[PDB]
Amino acid sequence: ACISIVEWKPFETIILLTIFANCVALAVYLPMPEDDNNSLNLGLEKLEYFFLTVFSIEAAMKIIAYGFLFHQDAYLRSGWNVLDFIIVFLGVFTAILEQVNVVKALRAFRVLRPLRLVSGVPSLQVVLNSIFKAMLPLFHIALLVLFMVIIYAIIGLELFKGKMHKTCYYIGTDIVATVENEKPSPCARTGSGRPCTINGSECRGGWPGPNHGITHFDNFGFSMLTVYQCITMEGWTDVLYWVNDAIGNEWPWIYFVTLILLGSFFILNLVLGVLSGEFTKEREKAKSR
Amino acid sequence: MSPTEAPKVRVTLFCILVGIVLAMTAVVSDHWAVLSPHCEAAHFGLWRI
Amino acid sequence: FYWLVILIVALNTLSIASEHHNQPLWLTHLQDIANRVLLSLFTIEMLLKMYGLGLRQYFMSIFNRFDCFVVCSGILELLLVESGAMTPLGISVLRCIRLLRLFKITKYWTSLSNLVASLLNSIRSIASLLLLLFLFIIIFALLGMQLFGGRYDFEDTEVRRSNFDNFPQALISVFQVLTGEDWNSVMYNGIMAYGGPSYPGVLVCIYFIILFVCGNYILLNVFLAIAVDNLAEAESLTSAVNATWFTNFILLFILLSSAALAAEDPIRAESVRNQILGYFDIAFTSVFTVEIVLKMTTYGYFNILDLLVVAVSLISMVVKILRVLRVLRPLRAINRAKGLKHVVQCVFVAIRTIGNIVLVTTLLQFMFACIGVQLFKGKFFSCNDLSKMTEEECRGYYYVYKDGDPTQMELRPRQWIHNDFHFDNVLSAMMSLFTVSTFEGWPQLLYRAIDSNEEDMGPVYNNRVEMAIFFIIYIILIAFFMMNIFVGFVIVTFQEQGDKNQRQCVQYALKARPLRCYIPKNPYQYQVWYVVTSSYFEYLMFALIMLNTICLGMQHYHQSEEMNHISDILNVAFTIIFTLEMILKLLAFKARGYFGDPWNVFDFLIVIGSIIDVILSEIDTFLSAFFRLFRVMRLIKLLSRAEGVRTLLWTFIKSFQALPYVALLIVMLFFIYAVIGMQMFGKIALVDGTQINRNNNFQTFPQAVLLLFRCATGEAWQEILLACSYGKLCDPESDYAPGEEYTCGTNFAYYYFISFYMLCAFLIINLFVAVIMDNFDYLTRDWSILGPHHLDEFKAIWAEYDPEAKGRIKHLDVVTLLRRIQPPLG
Amino acid sequence: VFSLGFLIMGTICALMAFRKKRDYLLRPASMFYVFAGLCLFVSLEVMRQSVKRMIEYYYSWSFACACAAFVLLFLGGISLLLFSLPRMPQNPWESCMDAE
Amino acid sequence: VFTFSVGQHNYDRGPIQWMACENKGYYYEIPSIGAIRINTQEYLDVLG
Ligand SMILES: CCCCCCCCCCCCCCCCCC(=O)OC[C@H](COP(=O)([O-])OCC[N+](C)(C)C)OC(=O)CCCCCCCCCCCCCCCCC
Ligand SMILES: CCCCCCCCCCCCCCCCCC(=O)OC[C@H](COP(=O)(O)OCCN)OC(=O)CCCCCCCCCCCCCCCCC
Ligand SMILES: CCCCCCCCCCCCCCCCCC(=O)OC[C@H](COP(=O)(O)OCCN)OC(=O)CCCCCCCCCCCCCCCCC
Ligand SMILES: CCCCCCCCCCCCCCCCCC(=O)OC[C@H](COP(=O)(O)OCCN)OC(=O)CCCCCCCCCCCCCCCCC
Ligand SMILES: CCOC(=O)C1=C(COCCN)NC(C)=C(C(=O)OC)[C@@H]1c1ccccc1Cl
Ligand SMILES: [Ca+2]
C-alpha cells in the first residue's frame, strides 16, 4: 500500500486530462477502406501504446493500494472502478492480440474510453444515476410498446407475407423500369394492384423487394423491422404506398393509419405523461429540502 | 332492466331486425349482378344465376 | 426621447431586411447611407446619455455593457471596409455583427427582457445533463466511424452525403439520426455497406435502433427537466325553438349538409352525382332558411354566423372563392353544441397568453433569416450537370448515363436551376428556415449550403463544412429549446386553471360499491370450478398463449411442404384447446357468472371467430384472409394479467373519452381543409415521380384526408407544397380551355400548407397537455402514502368473504380479515 | 347459410334475455349478430371475385340489400354489446364487474 | 508525367499536382463519367 501516497494527490486531473487526450486520438483518426492507411493513422497506433501503459499503471497502482485479493470486495463496489478495469483490460488484450497474430471488430471498444470522463467527474455521476432512476416507471410503457410491435408484426406477417416480389422490368431484360424520380414499386398483373404503365415493360416476379430487399413483411424479423420504422413515423407512407401497389388501395390503410394513431401518438402521450409526472414528483420532493 | 328497458337498446334491437329481413332477402333474391358479354343478360344470385 | 429611439431601431431593421439578391443600386446606396446615419445617432445619443447618466452608473446596467460594443464594432466595420479587406469570410462577420442591433428589441419588450433571464438560468441548472448528451453524441459518432467509416464504397454513382468518413461528417450524421429525419436511408446504406439483407448485415440495424431510442430518451429527459422544473419556479418568481328533438334534428341536418359537400367530384363539375347533390343542397338550404328567418323575430356572433352563411348558400346555384367560403357549414354546430362552444371558447383563452411567446420566436426566426441571407444569398443556383459552374456555361445539351453505365447514355438539355427553398430575400429565408424547423428535408438544405461557392456560381463539393453550425444552432434553438417553452406556456394555461389526499380518499369510501365473485354450488360444479379458477391453471393457460404466439411468428415466406402442413394443424390444436378452456369455464360459472366479466366476453368472441376461421380455411380441400386475425388477438388476453399495464391503459383511455371536443376540433380542421383543397388543388394530374400521384392526391375526399394526415405526420409536406404551385399539368378529365393545360395549381398553396401545419401542430399539443392534465393525480402519485390501489385491495378481500354483494358480513369474519390489510389502511 | 344460422342463433338469446332477470344474455346475442354480418361481408367479396373471372358487369338490386344488412347487423351487434356492457368505469372507485 | 485525380474524394491533391508540374507533365481531374472523354484526349496538347 506504498502507493496510497499517490492517489490522494491531484492524480485525478492528470488522469482525466489524458482521458481527453485519448478522445482526440480517436477523433483525428481517418477511417479508410479495404486496408489502407496514411502516416497520421500509423502515428496514432503508436500513441495507443502510450495511453495503454498510462491507464494500466494507474489501475495496477490503485488495485494494489485500496483494492486487494478481497480485503473488502468494496473498492470495486463503486460501479465505476469496475468500468475502468474493463476499459483498460480490453486495451491490453486487443493491443497484444494483433502483434501475436502477426479483430477490427474488437477495435470498436476503443470508443468506450470516453466513459471514464464521467467515471472521473463527480457531477456526471449523479446526473447519470438520476437519469437511470427515472427509467423504472417506464417499465409498463416499454412492456406495452413491445407487445404492440409484436402484434403488428404478426398481423403484417399474415396479410402481407410475400406480396411485394413482382415489379415491372423491360420485356426480356432484368432492368427494372422506373421513371424520373420514382423508386421501384411493386406491381400486380391480374389484380387490384397497380398495373405497370411504362411502355416496353412487363410485370415479373423474383424481385427482392422495395428498399433493396429490406422493407417487406415476409418473415418475422423483417416484419418487425418495418413495423418499428413505421412506428417512428419515418417512411410510413412509402410502406403504405407499396402495400397499395402490391394488393390494392382500399383495405391496407386501416393497418397503417391505425398503427400511427396507436403506436406513435398514443404511446408518445403515455411516455410524456409518465416522465413529466415523475419530474414533478421529484421537484415537489426537493422543494421541501 | 336498465339495459333492457332503456330506449337506446331497443332502437338497436329493432335496427338489427331490418338487417335480419334484408339478410333473409339477400339470401333468396337473385338480382345482385349482371353479365353483358355482347341481348342475353343474366341476373345473378347465390343459389342460381 | 425614449419613443424617438424606437423610430431609429426600427428604421434600422427595415434597412437590413430590405437586402436581397440583385438589388437596384439605389438600394445599396440607401442602405449604407442609412447605416452611417444611424451609427452616428447611436454613438452620439449613447454619449449624450453618458453625460446625462455619468460614466460610472451608465456602466451599471447589463444592456449598456453591450451598447458600446455596437458603437465600437459599427465604426470599426466602417473602417475595415476602408482597408485591404477582402472575401466573404471576414465580410460575413462584419455584416452579421451589424445585426446585433436587432438584439435591442428584446431588451425593449421588457417582458422579453426577463424571458431570457429565465431561459439562461434554466440551462445553467441542466448544463451537466446537456454535457452528458454531447458525450453520448460523441461516443456514437466514433462508433459510427468504426462501423461504417470507409465502407460506403458502393460502385454506383449515387451520392450519399450522410456517411461516417471523418469526424465532422460522422457528427452531422448522428445528429441527423437523432432529429429523426431520413434516418432510415442512413440505415439502408449501412445495411448494404455490409452484405445486404442477410444474417450478418441486418444486425447493423441495432446501431440505429439504440441510437434513435436512447438518444431521444435522453433528449426528452433534457428538454423536459426544463419545462417542468424551470418554469414552475418562474411561477414563484412572478406570483411573489327550445324543443329538444327539434334541435337534435337540426344538428343532424347540419351534418347532412356538410356531408353533401364532402362527396363532390372536383374534376368533372358536370357529374350527374353533382347534379343529384345540387338539388339536395338547395333543399337543405331552404330548410336552413325557413327555421332562422323565424328566429330573427323573438329578438332584434353565432346567431349572425349562419346569417352570413346561408346568404352565399342560396345565392349560388367571385365564383370559386364564394363556393370555397361555403365551408362555414361545420361552423354552425358550435352554438347548438354546449361542449363545443365550451371548448372553442376555452382555446381562444390560451391564445392571447401564448401570444407573447409566439412573437419572440417570430423575431428570433427573423434574425436567423437575415443571417442566412447574408451567408447564402445568390449561392443556391446550380446546373443540371455539375460540371458547368456559371450560367453562361450551363447551356446546350449533355449526357446522362443510366445506372452509371457509360455505354447507355441519353441527351438532356442543361439548365440553370434555382433551389426551391433558398435565401435570396428575407421572406424566402424565413420560408426555408420554417421548413428546417419541422425537420423535413433539412439535410438537403444543409448539403446544399455546405456546397455553396460564391454569389452566382454552382456548388463545390464539401466547400464549407463549417456552415453546418448555422443549421445545428438553429435546430437547437427553435426546434428543441424554444419549442419546449412554448409547451410550458400551455401547461400554465392548463395546470393553473384546474389535505389533497384526504378529500379524495374520503370520496372513495363514500361512493364505492362491492364486487361479485359467484362462488358455485353443486359439489361437481364447485369441483370443476376450483380447478378452473386455480392460479396455476391461470399460469398453464398463459403459457399456451406465449406458445401460440411463437407458432404464428415462425411463419415465413417461400418455405417448403412441411411447415405450412404442420402450421395449419397446430392452429386446429390451439383452437380446440381454447374452446375446451372456454366450455370448462362455462360449466363452472354457470353461463350467468361467466358473461358478467368483460374479459370472458372478449374471450368468447375470440373463440367463436377462431372456430369459424378453421372452417373457412378447411373447406378449401373439402368440396376471407381477415378471419385469420382472430388468432393474433388471442394475445390481448395477456393484458388481464398485467395489473399495471391495464390500469395505465384505462387511466389514459378514460381521459381520452372524457375529452371528445378537443378531438372534435381536429376532426373539424381536417374536414374543412380537405374540402378546401379538393377545390383548390383537385384538378392537378396524377403523374408518377411527382408528389401528386395515384397514392397521394386531392381528387376524392378520402384521398385528401389521408394526404392531410400525411402532412400532419410531416412526411414530405414541403414536397407536396411544391407540387401545387401553378406550373402544373391539368388532368385530362377536367375541363380546361385548349392550349392552356399547364395552369393548374395555386400559390395559395403556400398559405394553405403553412397554415395547416401550424394549426395542426397547435391542436395536437393542446390535446396532449389536456389528456395529461386530467390524469395528473395518477401520474404524480406517491405510492407510499395512500392510494385507490389499497382500496381496491380492500374491495377484493371484502368480496371474497361476501361474494353475493348483499352489503353485510358478520363480525367474526370482519375482525379476522383485519390482519390481512396492510399498515397504510389496516 | 353459415351467416343466416348465426343470426338465428343470435335471435333466440336476444329474445330469451327478456324474462327471468336474464339481462346478461344480451352480450352473447350481440356477438352472434356481428359474426353474421361478418360472414355476409365475406359472401359479398367471393361473389365479387367470381364476377371478375367471367362483357359488362353491374351490382344492381340485392347487392345493396346485403351491403346494408351486413353493415347494419355489424354496427347493431357492436352497439348492442356496448350498450349491454356497463361502462368504462370513469372514476377511481368504479369498476367493470360492479354490483348493479 | 501526367497525373489524373479521379472521383470525388476528400484526399489531398497537392502532391500529384507537384508530380505533374515538376516532370514536364500536366494535371487533370476526372470527377464523373461525362468528364472522361475530354480529359483523356487532352494530353496531346502538351505532347505537341
Ligand atoms: C396490446 C393492446 C393494444 C394492441 C391491440 C391493437 C392492435 C390493432 C390491430 C389492428 C389490425 C389492423 C387491421 C387489419 C388491416 C387490414 C389489411 C387490409 O385491409 O388489406 C389486406 C387484406 C386484403 O387481403 P387480400 O386477400 O384482399 O389480398 C389480395 C386480394 N385478393 C383477396 C383478391 C387475393 O385485408 C383483408 O384481408 C380484408 C380486410 C377487411 C377489413 C378489415 C378490417 C378489420 C379490422 C378493423 C380494425 C378496427 C380499427 C382498429 C381497432 C383498434 C385499433 C385502434
Ligand atoms: C422492453 C422495452 C423495449 C423492448 C426492447 C427489446 C426489443 C427486442 C425485440 C427484438 C426481437 C426481434 C427478433 C428477430 C429474430 C426472430 C427470428 C427471425 O427474425 O427470423 C424469422 C424465422 C425464420 O426466418 P428464416 O431465416 O427465413 O427461416 C428459414 C428460411 N427458409 O422465424 C422465427 O423463428 C421467428 C420466431 C420468433 C417468434 C416469436 C414471436 C413473439 C414471441 C414473444 C411472445 C411473448 C413476448 C415475450 C414475453 C415476455 C413477458 C414478460
Ligand atoms: C417581429 C415581427 C412581429 C410580427 C409577427 C406577426 C405574427 C407572425 C406569426 C405567423 C408565423 C409566421 C411563420 C411562418 C414562416 C413564414 C413563411 C413565409 O414567410 O413564406 C413566404 C413565402 C415565400 O416563399 P418563396 O420560396 O419566396 O416563394 C417563391 C414563390 N412565391 O410566400 C408565401 O406566400 C408564404 C405565405 C405565409 C403564410 C403564413 C400563414 C401562417 C398562419 C398561421 C396560423 C396558424 C398558427 C396558429 C397558432 C400556432 C401556435 C400558437
Ligand atoms: C391522435 C392525434 C392525431 C390525429 C387524431 C385524429 C385525427 C383523425 C384523422 C385521421 C386520418 C386518417 C383517415 C384516413 C382515411 C382515408 C381513407 C383512404 O385513404 O383510403 C383510400 C381508398 C382509395 O379509394 P378512393 O378514395 O375511392 O380512390 C382510389 C381509387 N378509386 O379509399 C377507399 O377505397 C375506401 C373508402 C374510405 C372511406 C372511409 C372513411 C375514411 C375517412 C373517414 C375518417 C374520418 C374523416 C373525417 C376527418 C378525419 C379526421 C378526424
Ligand atoms: C406550435 C406551432 O408550431 C409551429 O408551427 C412552429 C414551427 C414548427 O416547429 C416544430 C418544431 N419541429 N417552426 C417555426 C419557425 C414557428 C414560428 O416561427 O412561429 C411564428 C412555430 C414555432 C416554433 C417553435 C416554438 C413556437 C412556435 Cl409558434
Ligand atoms: Ca420525415
From Swiss-Prot, chain A:
It comes from the Eukaryota. Residues 29-43, 161-221, 244-251 are extracellular. Disulfide bonds join 168-196, 187-203. I repeats lie at residues 1-279. Coiled coil: none annotated. Glycans are attached at residues 37, 199. Detected in skeletal muscle T-tubules (at protein level). The chain crosses the membrane at residues 10-28, 44-64, 74-94, 103-121, 139-160, 252-272. Residues 222-243 dip into the membrane without crossing it. A motif (Selectivity filter of repeat I) lies at residues 232-235. Phosphorylated. Phosphorylation by PKA activates the calcium channel. Both the minor and major forms are phosphorylated in vitro by PKA. Residues 65-73, 122-138 are cytoplasmic. It is found in: Cell membrane, Sarcolemma, T-tubule. Ca(2+) binds at residue 234. Component of a calcium channel complex consisting of a pore-forming alpha subunit (CACNA1S) and the ancillary subunits CACNB1 or CACNB2, CACNG1 and CACNA2D1. The channel complex contains alpha, beta, gamma and delta subunits in a 1:1:1:1 ratio, i.e. it contains either CACNB1 or CACNB2. CACNA1S channel activity is modulated by the auxiliary subunits (CACNB1 or CACNB2, CACNG1 and CACNA2D1). Interacts with DYSF and JSRP1. Interacts with RYR1. Interacts with STAC, STAC2 and STAC3 (via their SH3 domains). Interaction with STAC3 promotes expression at the cell membrane. Belongs to the calcium channel alpha-1 subunit (TC 1.A.1.11) family. CACNA1S subfamily. This is Voltage-dependent L-type calcium channel subunit alpha-1S. The gene is CACNA1S. The chain holds residues 43 to 347 of 1873 of the full protein.
From Swiss-Prot, chain C:
III repeats lie at residues 241-494. A motif (Selectivity filter of repeat III) lies at residues 438-441. A motif (Selectivity filter of repeat IV) lies at residues 713-716. Disulfide bonds join 383-394, 730-744. Component of a calcium channel complex consisting of a pore-forming alpha subunit (CACNA1S) and the ancillary subunits CACNB1 or CACNB2, CACNG1 and CACNA2D1. The channel complex contains alpha, beta, gamma and delta subunits in a 1:1:1:1 ratio, i.e. it contains either CACNB1 or CACNB2. CACNA1S channel activity is modulated by the auxiliary subunits (CACNB1 or CACNB2, CACNG1 and CACNA2D1). Interacts with DYSF and JSRP1. Interacts with RYR1. Interacts with STAC, STAC2 and STAC3 (via their SH3 domains). Interaction with STAC3 promotes expression at the cell membrane. Belongs to the calcium channel alpha-1 subunit (TC 1.A.1.11) family. CACNA1S subfamily. Pore-forming, alpha-1S subunit of the voltage-gated calcium channel that gives rise to L-type calcium currents in skeletal muscle. Calcium channels containing the alpha-1S subunit play an important role in excitation-contraction coupling in skeletal muscle via their interaction with RYR1, which triggers Ca(2+) release from the sarcplasmic reticulum and ultimately results in muscle contraction. Long-lasting (L-type) calcium channels belong to the 'high-voltage activated' (HVA) group. This is Voltage-dependent L-type calcium channel subunit alpha-1S.
Curated annotation (Swiss-Prot), chain D:
Residues 45-60 are extracellular. Residues 19-23, 86-100 are cytoplasmic. Skeletal muscle (at protein level). It is found in: Cell membrane, Sarcolemma. The chain crosses the membrane at residues 1-18, 24-44, 61-85. Component of a calcium channel complex consisting of a pore-forming alpha subunit (CACNA1S) and the ancillary subunits CACNB1 or CACNB2, CACNG1 and CACNA2D1. The channel complex contains alpha, beta, gamma and delta subunits in a 1:1:1:1 ratio, i.e. it contains either CACNB1 or CACNB2. Regulatory subunit of the voltage-gated calcium channel that gives rise to L-type calcium currents in skeletal muscle. Regulates channel inactivation kinetics. This is Voltage-dependent calcium channel gamma-1 subunit. It comes from Oryctolagus cuniculus. The chain holds residues 112 to 219 of 222 of the full protein.
Curated annotation (Swiss-Prot), chain E:
Skeletal muscle. It is found in: Membrane; Cell membrane. Proteolytically processed into subunits alpha-2-1 and delta-1 that are disulfide-linked. Binds gabapentin, an antiepileptic drug. The MIDAS-like motif in the VWFA domain binds divalent metal cations and is required to promote trafficking of the alpha-1 (CACNA1) subunit to the plasma membrane by an integrin-like switch. The alpha-2/delta subunit of voltage-dependent calcium channels regulates calcium current density and activation/inactivation kinetics of the calcium channel. Plays an important role in excitation-contraction coupling. Dimer formed of alpha-2-1 and delta-1 chains; disulfide-linked. Voltage-dependent calcium channels are multisubunit complexes, consisting of alpha-1 (CACNA1), alpha-2 (CACNA2D), beta (CACNB) and delta (CACNA2D) subunits in a 1:1:1:1 ratio. Belongs to the calcium channel subunit alpha-2/delta family. This is Voltage-dependent calcium channel subunit alpha-2/delta-1. It comes from Oryctolagus cuniculus (Rabbit). The chain holds residues 386 to 433 of 1106 of the full protein.
